[PDB]
């Protein structure tokens, strides 16, 4: 009867609402289609108060809440986007990854292919703020499970066969990056104070 | 009124007290004085 929305755009919208972000580096077809039909996607998503913010420089899309410009509701609330607060370890790990990504961008430029970081590099850095939980096996398992948890949010790729990881471009658009820097520096200073 | 040291002479003629605020590193201090107390302070600067 009525016209049906194109198959590719339907696939794009469903995938984008499932994972929360596309990437040209891992889904070139779908990413290309959405940028060629920005009005169509933004129209499909507008009724839900959802909207896509496009980052051409890093070749990344992500779903963001659309709600109106600074109404009496200073902080947005949305039935679907359930806000979450990461636990301490996740926050510190995200701060470390944020710092690494920013540092690499400072050298290779914005949007440069992220250098692969070895798992071994991260363990000493977490040990600064968490000490040694008791064994190398325990700490490595903790790091692996934390990276698996973060992969859900799309911040990092899964460890490869050589036990390295990559930092997804999404980490640049976190909610409030000032929170990471302040907390990280605060603990980094407290450890020196107490030692 | 607020002025960054402009047309002060005009302020003298239509206001009775001034708040002198100065910067020092990352901390700013504020003082409240009358025009005549500041005039006396200048007269102390007048020895130079």
């Amino acid at each position: 009867s009525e016209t049906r929305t194109l198959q590719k755009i339907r696939e794009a919208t469903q995938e984008l609402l499932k994972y929360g972000l596309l990437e040209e580096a891992s889904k070139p077809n779908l990413y290309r289609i959405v940028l060629s039909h920005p009005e169509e996607v933004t129209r499909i998503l507008e009724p839900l108060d959802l909207d896509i913010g496009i980052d051409e420089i890093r070749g990344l899309l992500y779903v963001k809440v659309r709600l109106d410009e600074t109404p009496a509701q200073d902080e947005w609330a949305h039935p679907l986007v359930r806000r979450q607060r990461l636990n301490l370890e996740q926050s510190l790990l995200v701060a470390i990854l944020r710092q690494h990504f920013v540092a690499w961008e400072q050298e290779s430029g914005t949007g440069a292919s992220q250098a692969q970081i070895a798992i071994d590099d991260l363990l000493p850095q977490l040990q600064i703020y968490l000490g040694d939980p008791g064994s190398e096996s325990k700490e490595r398992t903790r790091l692996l499970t934390l990276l698996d948890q973060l992969k859900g949010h799309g911040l990092v790729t899964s460890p490869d066969a050589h036990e390295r990881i990559v930092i997804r471009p999404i980490i640049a658009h976190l909610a409030d990056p000032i929170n990471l820097q302040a907390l990280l520096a605060w603990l980094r200073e407290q450890i020196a104070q107490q030692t | 009124f607020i002025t960054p040291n402009k047309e002060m002479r005009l302020l003298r003629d239509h206001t009775r007290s001034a708040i002198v605020v100065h910067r020092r590193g990352q901390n700013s201090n504020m003082a409240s004085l009358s025009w005549e107390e500041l005039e006396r302070h200048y007269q102390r600067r007048g020895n130079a």
């Binding site: 929360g20 929170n179 907390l183 | 201090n29």
Partner: protein, 50 residues
């Protein structure tokens, strides 16, 4: 009794759209000390140039 019957899906609920904005970070208490210090800064005496 862990087979999966071919019954349809109804009431399919869409929630948890993982918008990156939705995240928040850990709040850590700082119980070091609380500041009485309320010195009146009487040192605000003028120190200004010509």
């Amino acid at each position: 009794r862990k087979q999966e019957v071919p019954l349809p899906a109804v009431g399919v609920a869409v929630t948890g759209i993982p918008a990156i904005e939705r995240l928040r970070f850990k709040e850590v208490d700082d119980e070091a000390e609380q500041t009485l210090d309320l010195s009146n800064h009487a040192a605000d005496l003028t120190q200004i140039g010509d």
